[PDB]
């Protein structure tokens, strides 16, 4: 039996709305932490269980509020989620990677009492938007103990990341900030062939698709985190043998399906 399993048997519908756990928030001021700009922690309340943790980075010029819906959404499905602010809104992808690393260390070692109560510090993952998604790829390369990485419409000038952390990339077909032909798709192709990987391309979507409630992003992000952070194979069904009308491409090496 699986000790990390949380929540009822999933349906796709349920993964497009906030989940079964009530969500508490904690605002982390920038001056209260070293190595990153604070942010917002979304975490389960009204529960005695523990959950894996996720550090999430916004993109260039953006703040944590640009991913608030997704922090809340993930927390409500059973995760402790710190959406960071960066030291400067102009920080690049590799700076964002360093700040994600600082944020993960903060979650494990110096986060608030109520947050530590809910966190299994052994089970951590990362996600990020745009330059924050480039930062997600880089920290995955740096920290093979991470359980999963979800780069959303990622941007980076480097195209090849040597990581074994399971990666699910979301591209936006009509992205003109991080065009999929130059960013997301090369990232996917250049990851090692042995790394479990998925690429989903949102039909006729812009770069800012991750910044508001988005059913596809919700389904794939929750499912990848459940599968890898919680070992929760009930979520394989949403990631394997996918036909989804919101997607205009779906690619995988199928390592996650068995």
Curated annotation (Swiss-Prot):
Gene3D superfamilies: alpha/beta hydrolase
Catalytic activity: cutin + H2O = cutin monomers; (ethylene terephthalate)(n) + H2O = (ethylene terephthalate)(n-1) + 4-[(2-hydroxyethoxy)carbonyl]benzoate + H(+); 4-[(2-hydroxyethoxy)carbonyl]benzoate + H2O = terephthalate + ethylene glycol + H(+); an acetyl ester + H2O = an aliphatic alcohol + acetate + H(+)
Pfam families on file: PETase (PF12740)
Disulfide bridge partners, by residue number: 240-257
PTM text: The disulfide bond between Cys-240 and Cys-257 contributes not only to the thermodynamic stability but also to the kinetic stability of the enzyme.
Protein name: Leaf-branch compost cutinase
Hydrolase listed as a keyword: yes
UniProt enzyme class: hydrolase
GO CC list: extracellular region
Regulation: Is inhibited in vitro by diethyl pNP-phosphate (E600), but not by EDTA.
UniProt-annotated binding residues for poly(ethylene terephthalate): 60, 131, 155
Further comment: The gene encoding this enzyme comes from a leaf-branch compost metagenome. The source organism remains to be identified. However, it is presumably a thermophilic bacterium.
Keyword terms: Disulfide bond, Hydrolase, Secreted, Serine esterase, Signal
Effect of pH on activity: Optimum pH is 8.5 with pNP-butyrate as substrate. Shows 70% of the maximal activity at pH 7.0 and pH 9.5.
GO MF entries: acetylesterase activity; cutinase activity
SUPFAM superfamilies in the cross-refs: alpha/beta-Hydrolases
Keyword Nucleotide-binding recorded: no
Regions that span the bilayer: none
Temperature impact on function: Optimum temperature is 50 degrees Celsius with pNP-butanoate as substrate. Optimum temperature using PET as substrate is superior to 70 degrees Celsius. Shows 70% of the maximal activity at 30 and 70 degrees Celsius with pNP-butyrate as substrate. Has half-lives of 5 hours at 50 degrees Celsius, 80 minutes at 60 degrees Celsius, 40 minutes at 70 degrees Celsius and 7 minutes at 80 degrees Celsius. Is thermostable, with a determined melting temperature (Tm) of 84.7 degrees Celsius.
Function field: Catalyzes the hydrolysis of cutin, a polyester that forms the structure of plant cuticle. Shows esterase activity towards p-nitrophenol-linked aliphatic esters (pNP-aliphatic esters), with a preference for short-chain substrates (C4 substrate at most). Cannot hydrolyze olive oil. Is also able to degrade poly(ethylene terephthalate), the most abundant polyester plastic in the world. Can also depolymerize poly(epsilon-caprolactone) (PCL), a synthetic aliphatic biodegradable polyester.
Superkingdom of source: Bacteria
Localization, UniProt: Secreted
Active site: 130 (nucleophile), 175 (charge relay system), 207 (charge relay system)
EC number(s) stated in the UniProt entry for this protein: 3.1.1.74, 3.1.1.101
Lineage: Bacteria, environmental samples
């Amino acid at each position: 039996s699986n000790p990390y399993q949380r929540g009822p048997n999933p349906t796709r519908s349920a993964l497009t709305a906030d989940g079964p756990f009530s969500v508490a928030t904690y605002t982390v001021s920038r001056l209260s932490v070293s190595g990153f700009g604070g942010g917002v922690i979304y975490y389960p309340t009204g529960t005695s269980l523990t959950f894996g943790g996720i550090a999430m980075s916004p993109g260039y010029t953006a703040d944590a509020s640009s991913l608030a819906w997704l922090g809340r959404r993930l927390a409500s499905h059973g995760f402790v989620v710190l959406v960071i602010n960066t030291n400067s809104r102009f920080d690049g992808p590799d700076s964002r990677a360093s700040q994600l690393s600082a944020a993960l260390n903060y979650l494990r070692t110096s986060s608030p009492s109520a947050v530590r109560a809910r966190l299994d510090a052994n089970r951590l993952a990362v996600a990020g938007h745009a330059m924050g998604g480039g930062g997600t790829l880089r920290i995955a390369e740096q920290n093979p103990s991470l359980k999963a990485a979800v780069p959303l419409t990622p941007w980076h000038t480097d195209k090849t990341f040597n990581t074994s952390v399971p990666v699910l990339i979301v591209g936006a077909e009509a992205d003109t900030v991080a065009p999929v032909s130059q960013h997301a798709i090369p990232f996917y192709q250049n990851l090692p062939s042995t790394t479990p990987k998925v690429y989903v391309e949102l039909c006729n979507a812009s770069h800012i698709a991750p910044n508001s409630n988005n059913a596809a992003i919700s389904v794939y992000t929750i499912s990848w985190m459940k599968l890898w952070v919680d070992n929760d194979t009930r979520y394989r069904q949403f990631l394997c043998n996918v036909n989804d009308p919101a997607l205009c491409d779906f690619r995988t090496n199928n390592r996650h399906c068995q």
